[PDB]
Recover the amino acids of this structure.
């Protein structure tokens, strides 16, 4: 024995996929030391990981 | 040397142009003489607070 269909249907389905994320930048002298000049000099006499 | 392109620079900076000092209105000198030049001083066990 074998079973075969006799009718058909048309279904529409949706698929959602991410493509990109938000682009950002950081001012490290702003985040660290604010507007203070002494802390900026200390940052200088520390290292350039920025 | 710098290659062709667009680069992210530090955020816009402004330098101060004024000075402001605000203190309370006091016209009397602290009583150094009464504290330091007191005639009698108490014993350590019965110390006094002012
Ligand atoms: C041969 C058969 O099965 N025919 C049916 C038809 O009668 C129906 O109108 C259609 C719509 O669902 O599906 C198929």
């Amino acid at each position: 024995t074998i079973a075969i269909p006799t009718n058909f249907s048309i279904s529409i389905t949706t698929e959602v996929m991410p493509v990109s994320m938000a682009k950002t930048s950081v001012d490290c002298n702003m985040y660290i030391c604010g507007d203070s000049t002494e802390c900026a000099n200390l940052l200088l006499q520390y290292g350039s990981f920025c | 040397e710098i290659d062709k392109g667009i680069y992210q620079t530090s955020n816009f900076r402004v330098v101060p142009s004024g000075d402001v000092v605000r203190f309370p209105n006091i016209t009397n000198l602290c009583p150094f003489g009464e504290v330091f030049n007191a005639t009698k001083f108490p014993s350590v066990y019965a110390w006094e607070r002012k």
About this structure: Chain A has two helices and no strands. The helical segments of chain A are 28-31, 37-44. The first helix of chain A runs from residue 28 to 31.
